[PDB]
Amino acid sequence: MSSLSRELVFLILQFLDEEKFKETVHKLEQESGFFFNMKYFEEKVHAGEWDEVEKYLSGFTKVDDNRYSMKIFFEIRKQKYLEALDRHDRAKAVDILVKDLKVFSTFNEEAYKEITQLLTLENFRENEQASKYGDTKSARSIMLIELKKLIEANPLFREKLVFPTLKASRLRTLINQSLNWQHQLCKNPRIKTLFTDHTCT
Amino acid sequence: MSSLSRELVFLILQFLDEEKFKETVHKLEQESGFFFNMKYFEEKVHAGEWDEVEKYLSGFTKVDDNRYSMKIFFEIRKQKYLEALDRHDRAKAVDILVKDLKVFSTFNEEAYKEITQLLTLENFRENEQASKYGDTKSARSIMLIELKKLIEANPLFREKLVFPTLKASRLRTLINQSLNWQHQLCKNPRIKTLFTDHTCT
Amino acid sequence: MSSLSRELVFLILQFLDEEKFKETVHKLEQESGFFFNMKYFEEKVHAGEWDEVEKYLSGFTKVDDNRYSMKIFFEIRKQKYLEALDRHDRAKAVDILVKDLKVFSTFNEEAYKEITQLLTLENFRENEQASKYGDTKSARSIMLIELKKLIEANPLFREKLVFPTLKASRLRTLINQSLNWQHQLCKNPRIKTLFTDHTCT
Amino acid sequence: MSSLSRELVFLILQFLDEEKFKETVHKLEQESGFFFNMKYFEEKVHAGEWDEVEKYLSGFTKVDDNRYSMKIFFEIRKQKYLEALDRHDRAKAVDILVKDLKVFSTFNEEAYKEITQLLTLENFRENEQASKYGDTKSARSIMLIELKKLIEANPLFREKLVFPTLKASRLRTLINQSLNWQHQLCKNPRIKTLFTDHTCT
Amino acid sequence: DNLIYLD
Amino acid sequence: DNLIYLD
Amino acid sequence: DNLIYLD
Amino acid sequence: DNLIYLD
Ligand SMILES: [Zn+2]
Ligand SMILES: [Zn+2]
Ligand SMILES: [Zn+2]
Ligand SMILES: [Zn+2]
C-alpha cells in the first residue's frame, strides 16, 4: 500500500468519524491496521466486550508476534476467565481455559496449572496470588492500565497510536479543490456530481 | 446529510472495495444506509450467518417498518428456528421462538401457534405445511429467492440496490485533481502529503 | 403369588415399618403391588419428587391402563411442566413436554397444543385457563386432592388403599410361635438361631 | 437391634430374593446394613450406575470412616470423572471434580491438582500416569478388582460379605411352624389368615 | 383439556 | 401463515 | 495419588 | 505467572 493510499485512509477515518459512522471507523482502523484507537480500546475493555477487543486487536497483532502481544492476549483472556469464575459459570470458565488460555501453557506451564486450579475454589480469591482481584470494575481498570503500557511499548504499534494532526474535514476540502480544478478547465465557463468531471459547454 | 456527502460515501465505498477492506465496506453500507449490497446479503444468507444478516438489515429497515420488511425478518427468523429444530436443539429453538419470532404473533396468532407446535414433532417435516423443507442448503436457497423479491419490492430499498456507475478509483482521481490544483497555485513552481496543502516557495 | 405369600408381604411391610426401614417399605409396596401408601404418595407429591412419584406409581399402574390412570399421569406431568415454566426453565419444559406429555396428545390433540403454547408466554398465567395456577405449593395441594380422588376411584387400586388391621409386630409373634413349636418337640427338654431348628439333646 | 431382629432381616432378605423383589432386597441390605451384596455391587459398577453405587455404599460406610472407604469413594468418583472427560463433557467433569472429588484434596493436594489438570487435555491419556486408562469397560473392570479388594479388607464390612447358609424358604418354613403351633392348641381340633391366630371351636 | 371427571 | 405476497 | 494400598 | 514486564 502506497504512502498516498495510507494517508487517504487517515482522511477517510477523519471523514467517517465526523459523519459519526462509528463501527465503520473502527473496522477501517482494524482492517487497514494503520491506526490503533486507544480510546476505543479502553472503552471496549471497560465494557468487557472481549470478543470485539480481540477482533480489533487482530488487525494489529497476533498472540505470538512478540512477548508484549502475548501478554496482552494472556491478560485479556485471564480476565475473561476470572470473570466467568466470578459469576460461578465454571463450564464457561473451562471453555475459556481450554480454547483461549491453553496456547500460553507452552510458554508457561506452571502458570497455566495455577490458573486451572482456580476452577475448584469456591471463590478464587482464596488463592493468595489471586486475592488481589477486587471486583470486576476495578480488575478491568487495573488490567487496562497494564494493557495500555504493553501496547505503548509493543513495537508493532509504534507509529499507530497518535492520529495525524489534520484540519477538520480535510477530505471534503480536497474534494472541493477537485471541483475547483474541474471548473477551472472550462471555457467559456458558465456541479452535477462527484461521479463524473464537471463541464461548462 | 448532503447530496455531496452521500456521493462521497459512494466514492469511499468504491475505494474500500478496491482496497479490499471488506468488513469496512459493509459496515459503511449499513451505517450510511445508502447502498444495500445484495450480493453480500445472499452470501451471508447462504452461509446462515443470521446475526450478521439482521445486523446488516438493521441499517436499512426495522421489522415493523412495513409488511415487506416484516416478512423479510419473519422468513429469516423462521429459517433460523427450523434449522435449530433440524439439528435437534429444541432449547435453542424455543429461545428463537420467544426472542425473535414472538413479535410476529400479534400480526398473526395462528401462524405463530402452528410454528410453536413444530417443537414437539420428532421431525418437523411431519407437518404437511412444513414438509416442503428439504435440507438446509435448499431451504436457504428457496427462501433467499423470496427475500430478494421482498427486498426489491420493499419501498425502503428503492434507490439502494444498484451501485452508481463510476470509473474505477474515482476518489483517487479526485485526490490527484486536488494535488494538481494545489501545485497550480505555486509561483515560481518548482508533494509532501495529503494532510496539508502543497507549496513551492 | 399365593394368598399366604401376599399376607406374608403385609407382615413384612409391618415389620419394616416398625424397624423404620422406610425406603425398603415403599420399595416392597411398589414391587409387590399389594399396597399403595397414600400417605407416602401425598408426601412425595407435596415435595414435588416427581421421579419417585412415577416410579412408585409404576408398581401399580401404567399410563394407559385406563382413563383414571391416564389422568393421574397427565396431571402429574402437567404440574412438572408448569413448575419448569414457573422457574423460567423453558429448555426443561420442552423436554418434559416432548418426553412425558406427548403420549397424551393422541388422546387429546387440542389440549396438548394449548399446553405447548404456554411455552411462549412470559408468565403462563396469561392464559385464562392457566390463570388458576397460584403458587407451586397451592398448585401441588389442589392437584393432590384430584390425584387422591382419581386413585381412590381407579379400579386398579380398589383393595390396595387400606392396610389390613393387625396387632403390632405380628411377624415377630409368629416367629416366637415357631420357636415354641420347635422347643415343644424336644425330649427331654432342657435358642441358637432362626436359621436352623432348635434342639434339646 | 437384637440378634433375633438381625436374623429376621436375613430371613426376609432370602424371602424377597425368592420372590424376586430385587430393588426391595438391595434396599433392605442397604438400610439394615447387615449384608453387602458384592454381586449386586459388581453389577452396578460394571454398568456405571454411580448414583446407585454410592447410595448402596452409604448404608455401610461414609467416605471418611477409614482409609479403605476413602479410597473406595475416591476410585469411584475418579472413574466417574474420567468417563465424563472421555465423552468430552468438561462441564460435567468439573462439576464432579468440585462436588465429589474435592473432599479428597485435603488428604492429598497434589493428587487433586494432577486430576484437575486433566481437564485441559484434548485426551486425558496424554498424562503418562493416566495413559493406563484403556476404554470405559476395561477401566471399570480393573477398578472393580481394586474395589473388591478394598471392600474385603475394609473392617466395616468384615461380617457382611457372606450370606448365612440357610435352607431355601426358611421364613416360609417358620411361618408354617407357627400355623402348626396354633392348630395344636385347638380342642376339639377340626386356616383363615396369617393376620390373626387360627382357631377350631 | 385432557379430562375424565368423576363421582 | 405470516404472509404478504407480491408482484 | 490418593493411595492407601493393601495386603 | 505468564509475565514479561516493562519500562
Ligand atoms: Zn466549468
Ligand atoms: Zn507547486
Ligand atoms: Zn427344646
Ligand atoms: Zn385348630
Side-chain angles (χ1 to χ4, degrees), chain A residues 1-186 189 191 193-201, chain B residues 1-186 189 191 193-201, chain C residues 1-186 189 191 193-201, chain D residues 1-186 189 191 193-201, chain E residues 1-2 4-7, chain F residues 1-2 4-7, chain G residues 1-2 4-7, chain H residues 1-2 4-7:
Chain A
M1 195 155 187
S2 175
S3 188
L4 188 291
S5 310
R6 161 192 168 85
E7 283 185 345
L8 194 43
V9 169
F10 275 103
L11 259 36
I12 291 167
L13 282 175
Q14 188 193 48
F15 171 88
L16 297 168
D17 179 69
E18 292 178 2
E19 295 296 326
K20 293 170 157 47
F21 296 146
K22 262 40 217 186
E23 289 179 59
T24 303
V25 169
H26 302 306
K27 281 298 187 190
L28 184 51
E29 293 168 343
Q30 174 192 139
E31 284 190 313
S32 75
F34 290 148
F35 175 72
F36 184 86
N37 196 316
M38 183 63 81
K39 175 208 186 65
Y40 175 67
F41 179 76
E42 294 162 357
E43 149 187 335
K44 289 306 174 183
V45 171
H46 277 311
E49 303 275 9
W50 308 125
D51 279 3
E52 165 64 11
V53 159
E54 292 226 4
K55 235 193 138 303
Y56 189 70
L57 275 173
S58 79
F60 301 87
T61 190
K62 292 180 153 67
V63 60
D64 62 357
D65 278 339
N66 59 59
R67 291 292 172 185
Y68 301 94
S69 72
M70 181 155 300
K71 184 150 191 195
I72 285 157
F73 284 98
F74 174 77
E75 289 287 294
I76 291 165
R77 293 164 182 193
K78 187 213 283 164
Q79 182 58 24
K80 186 184 172 186
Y81 173 77
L82 291 181
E83 288 179 13
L85 292 177
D86 218 36
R87 70 174 68 102
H88 308 288
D89 195 341
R90 270 183 270 253
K92 181 55 168 181
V94 184
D95 195 44
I96 298 168
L97 184 64
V98 173
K99 279 185 161 76
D100 304 331
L101 281 169
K102 196 170 174 188
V103 61
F104 306 102
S105 64
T106 312
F107 309 97
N108 205 321
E109 311 280 1
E110 177 56 31
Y112 186 71
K113 289 182 179 176
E114 190 161 15
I115 282 153
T116 300
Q117 264 122 77
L118 301 176
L119 267 173
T120 60
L121 273 29
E122 203 61 54
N123 184 358
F124 61 89
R125 295 168 181 82
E126 293 160 24
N127 190 314
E128 72 276 9
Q129 298 170 252
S131 59
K132 41 215 56 178
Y133 189 99
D135 58 5
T136 303
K137 181 182 174 126
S138 71
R140 286 182 186 171
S141 287
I142 165 141
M143 159 224 221
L144 215 213
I145 291 174
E146 175 73 9
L147 256 26
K148 291 188 57 160
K149 288 177 190 168
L150 288 167
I151 288 164
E152 286 163 0
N154 192 325
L156 289 175
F157 298 80
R158 61 170 292 264
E159 252 158 7
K160 306 188 171 188
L161 291 179
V162 178
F163 202 84
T165 21
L166 330 167
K167 297 183 190 179
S169 310
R170 180 56 177 167
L171 182 56
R172 285 176 181 274
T173 294
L174 291 182
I175 291 303
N176 189 253
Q177 292 179 1
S178 295
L179 297 182
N180 276 54
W181 187 84
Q182 294 170 21
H183 172 67
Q184 161 254 28
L185 295 181
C186 295
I191 312 302
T193 175
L194 298 186
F195 294 165
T196 56
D197 288 349
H198 148 92
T199 179
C200 291
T201 85
Chain B
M1 195 155 187
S2 175
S3 188
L4 188 291
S5 310
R6 161 192 168 85
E7 283 185 345
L8 194 43
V9 169
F10 275 103
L11 259 36
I12 291 167
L13 282 175
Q14 188 193 48
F15 171 88
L16 297 168
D17 179 69
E18 292 178 2
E19 295 296 326
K20 293 170 157 47
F21 296 146
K22 262 40 217 186
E23 289 179 59
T24 303
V25 169
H26 302 306
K27 281 298 187 190
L28 184 51
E29 293 168 343
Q30 174 192 139
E31 284 190 313
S32 75
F34 290 148
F35 175 72
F36 184 86
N37 196 316
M38 183 63 81
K39 175 208 186 65
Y40 175 67
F41 179 76
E42 294 162 357
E43 149 187 335
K44 289 306 174 183
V45 171
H46 277 311
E49 303 275 9
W50 308 125
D51 279 3
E52 165 64 11
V53 159
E54 292 226 4
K55 235 193 138 303
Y56 189 70
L57 275 173
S58 79
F60 301 87
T61 190
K62 292 180 153 67
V63 60
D64 62 357
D65 278 339
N66 59 59
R67 291 292 172 185
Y68 301 94
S69 72
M70 181 155 300
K71 184 150 191 195
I72 285 157
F73 284 98
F74 174 77
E75 289 287 294
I76 291 165
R77 293 164 182 193
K78 187 213 283 164
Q79 182 58 24
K80 186 184 172 186
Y81 173 77
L82 291 181
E83 288 179 13
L85 292 177
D86 218 36
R87 70 174 68 102
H88 308 288
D89 195 341
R90 270 183 270 253
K92 181 55 168 181
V94 184
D95 195 44
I96 298 168
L97 184 64
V98 173
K99 279 185 161 76
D100 304 331
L101 281 169
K102 196 170 174 188
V103 61
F104 306 102
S105 64
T106 312
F107 309 97
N108 205 321
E109 311 280 1
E110 177 56 31
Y112 186 71
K113 289 182 179 176
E114 190 161 15
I115 282 153
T116 300
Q117 264 122 77
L118 301 176
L119 267 173
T120 60
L121 273 29
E122 203 61 54
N123 184 358
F124 61 89
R125 295 168 181 82
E126 293 160 24
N127 190 314
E128 72 276 9
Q129 298 170 252
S131 59
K132 41 215 56 178
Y133 189 99
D135 58 5
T136 303
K137 181 182 174 126
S138 71
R140 286 182 186 171
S141 287
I142 165 141
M143 159 224 221
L144 215 213
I145 291 174
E146 175 73 9
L147 256 26
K148 291 188 57 160
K149 288 177 190 168
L150 288 167
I151 288 164
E152 286 163 0
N154 192 325
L156 289 175
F157 298 80
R158 61 170 292 264
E159 252 158 7
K160 306 188 171 188
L161 291 179
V162 178
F163 202 84
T165 21
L166 330 167
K167 297 183 190 179
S169 310
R170 180 56 177 167
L171 182 56
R172 285 176 181 274
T173 294
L174 291 182
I175 291 303
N176 189 253
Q177 292 179 1
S178 295
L179 297 182
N180 276 54
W181 187 84
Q182 294 170 21
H183 172 67
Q184 161 254 28
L185 295 181
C186 295
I191 312 302
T193 175
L194 298 186
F195 294 165
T196 56
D197 288 349
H198 148 92
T199 179
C200 291
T201 85
Chain C
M1 195 155 187
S2 175
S3 188
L4 188 291
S5 310
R6 161 192 168 85
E7 283 185 345
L8 194 43
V9 169
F10 275 103
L11 259 36
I12 291 167
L13 282 175
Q14 188 193 48
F15 171 88
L16 297 168
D17 179 69
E18 292 178 2
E19 295 296 326
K20 293 170 157 47
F21 296 146
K22 262 40 217 186
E23 289 179 59
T24 303
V25 169
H26 302 306
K27 281 298 187 190
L28 184 51
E29 293 168 343
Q30 174 192 139
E31 284 190 313
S32 75
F34 290 148
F35 175 72
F36 184 86
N37 196 316
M38 183 63 81
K39 175 208 186 65
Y40 175 67
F41 179 76
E42 294 162 357
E43 149 187 335
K44 289 306 174 183
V45 171
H46 277 311
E49 303 275 9
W50 308 125
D51 279 3
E52 165 64 11
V53 159
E54 292 226 4
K55 235 193 138 303
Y56 189 70
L57 275 173
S58 79
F60 301 87
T61 190
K62 292 180 153 67
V63 60
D64 62 357
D65 278 339
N66 59 59
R67 291 292 172 185
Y68 301 94
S69 72
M70 181 155 300
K71 184 150 191 195
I72 285 157
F73 284 98
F74 174 77
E75 289 287 294
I76 291 165
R77 293 164 182 193
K78 187 213 283 164
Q79 182 58 24
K80 186 184 172 186
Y81 173 77
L82 291 181
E83 288 179 13
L85 292 177
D86 218 36
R87 70 174 68 102
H88 308 288
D89 195 341
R90 270 183 270 253
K92 181 55 168 181
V94 184
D95 195 44
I96 298 168
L97 184 64
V98 173
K99 279 185 161 76
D100 304 331
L101 281 169
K102 196 170 174 188
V103 61
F104 306 102
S105 64
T106 312
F107 309 97
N108 205 321
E109 311 280 1
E110 177 56 31
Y112 186 71
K113 289 182 179 176
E114 190 161 15
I115 282 153
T116 300
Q117 264 122 77
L118 301 176
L119 267 173
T120 60
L121 273 29
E122 203 61 54
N123 184 358
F124 61 89
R125 295 168 181 82
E126 293 160 24
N127 190 314
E128 72 276 9
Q129 298 170 252
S131 59
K132 41 215 56 178
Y133 189 99
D135 58 5
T136 303
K137 181 182 174 126
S138 71
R140 286 182 186 171
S141 287
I142 165 141
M143 159 224 221
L144 215 213
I145 291 174
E146 175 73 9
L147 256 26
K148 291 188 57 160
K149 288 177 190 168
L150 288 167
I151 288 164
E152 286 163 0
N154 192 325
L156 289 175
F157 298 80
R158 61 170 292 264
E159 252 158 7
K160 306 188 171 188
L161 291 179
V162 178
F163 202 84
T165 21
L166 330 167
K167 297 183 190 179
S169 310
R170 180 56 177 167
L171 182 56
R172 285 176 181 274
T173 294
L174 291 182
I175 291 303
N176 189 253
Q177 292 179 1
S178 295
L179 297 182
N180 276 54
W181 187 84
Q182 294 170 21
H183 172 67
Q184 161 254 28
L185 295 181
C186 295
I191 312 302
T193 175
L194 298 186
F195 294 165
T196 56
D197 288 349
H198 148 92
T199 179
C200 291
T201 85
Chain D
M1 195 155 187
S2 175
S3 188
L4 188 291
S5 310
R6 161 192 168 85
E7 283 185 345
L8 194 43
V9 169
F10 275 103
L11 259 36
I12 291 167
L13 282 175
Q14 188 193 48
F15 171 88
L16 297 168
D17 179 69
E18 292 178 2
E19 295 296 326
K20 293 170 157 47
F21 296 146
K22 262 40 217 186
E23 289 179 59
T24 303
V25 169
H26 302 306
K27 281 298 187 190
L28 184 51
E29 293 168 343
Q30 174 192 139
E31 284 190 313
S32 75
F34 290 148
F35 175 72
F36 184 86
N37 196 316
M38 183 63 81
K39 175 208 186 65
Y40 175 67
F41 179 76
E42 294 162 357
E43 149 187 335
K44 289 306 174 183
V45 171
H46 277 311
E49 303 275 9
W50 308 125
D51 279 3
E52 165 64 11
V53 159
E54 292 226 4
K55 235 193 138 303
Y56 189 70
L57 275 173
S58 79
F60 301 87
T61 190
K62 292 180 153 67
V63 60
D64 62 357
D65 278 339
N66 59 59
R67 291 292 172 185
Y68 301 94
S69 72
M70 181 155 300
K71 184 150 191 195
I72 285 157
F73 284 98
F74 174 77
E75 289 287 294
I76 291 165
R77 293 164 182 193
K78 187 213 283 164
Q79 182 58 24
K80 186 184 172 186
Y81 173 77
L82 291 181
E83 288 179 13
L85 292 177
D86 218 36
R87 70 174 68 102
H88 308 288
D89 195 341
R90 270 183 270 253
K92 181 55 168 181
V94 184
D95 195 44
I96 298 168
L97 184 64
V98 173
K99 279 185 161 76
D100 304 331
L101 281 169
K102 196 170 174 188
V103 61
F104 306 102
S105 64
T106 312
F107 309 97
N108 205 321
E109 311 280 1
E110 177 56 31
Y112 186 71
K113 289 182 179 176
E114 190 161 15
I115 282 153
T116 300
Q117 264 122 77
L118 301 176
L119 267 173
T120 60
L121 273 29
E122 203 61 54
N123 184 358
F124 61 89
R125 295 168 181 82
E126 293 160 24
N127 190 314
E128 72 276 9
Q129 298 170 252
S131 59
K132 41 215 56 178
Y133 189 99
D135 58 5
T136 303
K137 181 182 174 126
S138 71
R140 286 182 186 171
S141 287
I142 165 141
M143 159 224 221
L144 215 213
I145 291 174
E146 175 73 9
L147 256 26
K148 291 188 57 160
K149 288 177 190 168
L150 288 167
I151 288 164
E152 286 163 0
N154 192 325
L156 289 175
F157 298 80
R158 61 170 292 264
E159 252 158 7
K160 306 188 171 188
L161 291 179
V162 178
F163 202 84
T165 21
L166 330 167
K167 297 183 190 179
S169 310
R170 180 56 177 167
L171 182 56
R172 285 176 181 274
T173 294
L174 291 182
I175 291 303
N176 189 253
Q177 292 179 1
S178 295
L179 297 182
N180 276 54
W181 187 84
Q182 294 170 21
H183 172 67
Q184 161 254 28
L185 295 181
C186 295
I191 312 302
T193 175
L194 298 186
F195 294 165
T196 56
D197 288 349
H198 148 92
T199 179
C200 291
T201 85
Chain E
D1 166 38
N2 186 101
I4 167 195
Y5 291 108
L6 26 47
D7 193 331
Chain F
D1 166 38
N2 186 101
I4 167 195
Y5 291 108
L6 26 47
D7 193 331
Chain G
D1 166 38
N2 186 101
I4 167 195
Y5 291 108
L6 26 47
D7 193 331
Chain H
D1 166 38
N2 186 101
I4 167 195
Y5 291 108
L6 26 47
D7 193 331

Coordinates of all heavy atoms in Angstrom, one line a residue, chain C residues 10-36:
Chain C
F10 N -47.5 -58.4 53.6 CA -48.1 -57.4 54.5 C -47.4 -57.5 55.9 O -47.3 -56.5 56.6 CB -49.6 -57.6 54.7 CG -50.4 -57.0 53.6 CD1 -50.9 -57.7 52.5 CD2 -50.6 -55.6 53.6 CE1 -51.6 -57.0 51.5 CE2 -51.3 -55.0 52.6 CZ -51.8 -55.7 51.6
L11 N -47.1 -58.7 56.4 CA -46.5 -58.9 57.7 C -45.0 -58.3 57.6 O -44.6 -57.7 58.6 CB -46.4 -60.4 58.0 CG -47.4 -60.9 59.0 CD1 -48.7 -60.3 58.9 CD2 -47.5 -62.4 58.8
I12 N -44.4 -58.5 56.5 CA -43.1 -57.9 56.3 C -43.1 -56.4 56.2 O -42.3 -55.7 56.8 CB -42.4 -58.6 55.1 CG1 -42.1 -60.0 55.4 CG2 -41.1 -57.8 54.7 CD1 -41.8 -60.8 54.2
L13 N -44.1 -55.9 55.5 CA -44.4 -54.5 55.4 C -44.5 -53.9 56.8 O -43.9 -52.8 57.1 CB -45.6 -54.1 54.6 CG -45.5 -54.2 53.1 CD1 -46.8 -54.0 52.4 CD2 -44.4 -53.2 52.6
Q14 N -45.2 -54.5 57.7 CA -45.4 -54.1 59.1 C -44.1 -54.1 59.8 O -43.7 -53.1 60.5 CB -46.4 -54.9 59.8 CG -46.8 -54.3 61.2 CD -47.5 -55.3 62.1 OE1 -47.1 -56.5 62.2 NE2 -48.6 -54.8 62.7
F15 N -43.3 -55.2 59.7 CA -42.0 -55.3 60.3 C -41.1 -54.2 59.9 O -40.4 -53.6 60.7 CB -41.4 -56.7 60.0 CG -40.0 -56.9 60.4 CD1 -39.7 -57.3 61.7 CD2 -39.0 -56.6 59.5 CE1 -38.3 -57.4 62.1 CE2 -37.6 -56.7 59.9 CZ -37.3 -57.2 61.2
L16 N -41.0 -54.0 58.6 CA -40.0 -53.0 58.0 C -40.4 -51.6 58.5 O -39.5 -50.8 58.8 CB -40.0 -53.0 56.5 CG -39.6 -54.3 55.8 CD1 -39.9 -54.3 54.3 CD2 -38.1 -54.5 56.0
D17 N -41.7 -51.3 58.6 CA -42.1 -50.0 59.1 C -41.8 -49.9 60.6 O -41.3 -48.8 61.0 CB -43.7 -49.9 58.9 CG -44.2 -48.6 59.4 OD1 -43.9 -47.5 58.8 OD2 -44.9 -48.6 60.4
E18 N -42.0 -50.9 61.4 CA -41.6 -50.9 62.8 C -40.1 -50.8 63.0 O -39.7 -50.2 63.9 CB -42.2 -52.1 63.5 CG -43.7 -52.2 63.6 CD -44.2 -53.4 64.3 OE1 -43.4 -54.3 64.7 OE2 -45.4 -53.6 64.3
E19 N -39.3 -51.3 62.0 CA -37.9 -51.2 62.1 C -37.4 -49.9 61.4 O -36.2 -49.6 61.4 CB -37.2 -52.4 61.4 CG -37.5 -53.7 62.1 CD -36.9 -53.8 63.5 OE1 -35.8 -53.2 63.7 OE2 -37.5 -54.4 64.3
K20 N -38.4 -49.2 60.9 CA -38.1 -47.9 60.3 C -37.2 -48.0 59.1 O -36.4 -47.1 58.7 CB -37.5 -46.9 61.3 CG -38.5 -46.5 62.4 CD -37.9 -45.8 63.5 CE -38.9 -44.9 64.3 NZ -40.1 -45.7 64.6
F21 N -37.3 -49.1 58.4 CA -36.6 -49.3 57.1 C -37.5 -48.7 56.0 O -38.2 -49.4 55.2 CB -36.3 -50.7 56.8 CG -35.3 -51.4 57.8 CD1 -35.4 -52.7 58.1 CD2 -34.3 -50.6 58.3 CE1 -34.5 -53.3 59.0 CE2 -33.4 -51.2 59.2 CZ -33.5 -52.5 59.5
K22 N -37.5 -47.4 55.9 CA -38.6 -46.6 55.2 C -38.5 -46.8 53.7 O -39.6 -47.0 53.0 CB -38.4 -45.1 55.5 CG -39.4 -44.6 56.6 CD -39.5 -45.6 57.7 CE -41.0 -45.6 58.2 NZ -41.2 -46.4 59.4
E23 N -37.3 -46.7 53.1 CA -37.2 -46.9 51.6 C -37.6 -48.3 51.3 O -38.1 -48.6 50.2 CB -35.8 -46.5 51.1 CG -35.5 -45.1 51.2 CD -34.1 -44.8 50.7 OE1 -33.7 -45.1 49.6 OE2 -33.3 -44.2 51.5
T24 N -37.2 -49.3 52.1 CA -37.5 -50.7 51.9 C -39.0 -50.9 51.9 O -39.5 -51.7 51.1 CB -36.7 -51.6 52.9 OG1 -35.3 -51.3 52.9 CG2 -37.0 -53.0 52.6
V25 N -39.7 -50.3 52.8 CA -41.1 -50.4 52.9 C -41.8 -50.0 51.6 O -42.6 -50.8 51.0 CB -41.7 -49.5 54.0 CG1 -43.2 -49.4 53.9 CG2 -41.3 -49.9 55.4
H26 N -41.4 -48.9 51.1 CA -42.1 -48.4 49.9 C -41.6 -49.1 48.6 O -42.4 -49.2 47.7 CB -41.8 -46.9 49.8 CG -42.3 -46.1 51.0 ND1 -43.6 -46.3 51.5 CD2 -41.7 -45.3 51.9 CE1 -43.8 -45.6 52.6 NE2 -42.6 -45.0 52.8
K27 N -40.4 -49.6 48.6 CA -40.0 -50.5 47.5 C -40.8 -51.8 47.5 O -41.1 -52.3 46.4 CB -38.5 -50.8 47.6 CG -37.6 -49.7 47.2 CD -37.7 -49.4 45.7 CE -36.7 -48.4 45.2 NZ -37.0 -47.9 43.8
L28 N -41.1 -52.3 48.7 CA -41.8 -53.6 48.7 C -43.3 -53.3 48.3 O -43.9 -54.1 47.6 CB -41.8 -54.2 50.2 CG -42.5 -55.5 50.4 CD1 -42.0 -56.5 49.3 CD2 -42.2 -56.0 51.8
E29 N -43.9 -52.2 48.8 CA -45.2 -51.8 48.4 C -45.3 -51.7 46.8 O -46.1 -52.4 46.2 CB -45.5 -50.4 48.9 CG -45.7 -50.5 50.5 CD -45.8 -49.1 51.1 OE1 -45.4 -48.1 50.4 OE2 -46.3 -48.9 52.2
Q30 N -44.3 -51.0 46.3 CA -44.2 -50.9 44.8 C -44.0 -52.2 44.1 O -44.7 -52.5 43.1 CB -43.0 -49.9 44.5 CG -42.7 -49.8 43.0 CD -41.4 -49.0 42.8 OE1 -40.6 -49.4 41.9 NE2 -41.1 -48.0 43.6
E31 N -43.0 -53.0 44.5 CA -42.7 -54.2 43.7 C -43.7 -55.3 43.9 O -43.9 -56.0 42.9 CB -41.3 -54.7 44.1 CG -40.1 -53.9 43.5 CD -38.8 -54.5 43.7 OE1 -38.5 -55.0 44.8 OE2 -38.0 -54.6 42.7
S32 N -44.3 -55.4 45.0 CA -45.3 -56.4 45.3 C -46.6 -55.9 44.6 O -47.4 -56.7 44.1 CB -45.5 -56.7 46.8 OG -46.2 -55.6 47.3
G33 N -46.8 -54.6 44.7 CA -48.0 -54.0 44.2 C -49.2 -54.2 45.1 O -50.4 -53.9 44.7
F34 N -49.0 -54.8 46.3 CA -50.1 -55.2 47.1 C -50.7 -54.1 47.9 O -51.9 -54.1 48.3 CB -49.7 -56.3 48.1 CG -49.4 -57.6 47.5 CD1 -48.4 -58.5 48.0 CD2 -50.1 -58.0 46.3 CE1 -48.1 -59.7 47.3 CE2 -49.8 -59.3 45.7 CZ -48.8 -60.1 46.2
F35 N -50.0 -53.0 48.2 CA -50.5 -51.9 49.0 C -49.9 -50.6 48.5 O -48.7 -50.4 48.4 CB -50.1 -52.1 50.5 CG -50.5 -51.0 51.3 CD1 -51.8 -50.7 51.6 CD2 -49.5 -50.1 51.9 CE1 -52.2 -49.6 52.4 CE2 -49.9 -49.0 52.7 CZ -51.2 -48.8 52.9
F36 N -50.8 -49.7 48.2 CA -50.5 -48.3 47.8 C -50.5 -47.4 49.0 O -51.6 -47.2 49.6 CB -51.4 -47.8 46.7 CG -51.0 -46.4 46.1 CD1 -50.1 -46.3 45.1 CD2 -51.6 -45.3 46.7 CE1 -49.7 -45.1 44.7 CE2 -51.3 -44.0 46.2 CZ -50.3 -43.9 45.2

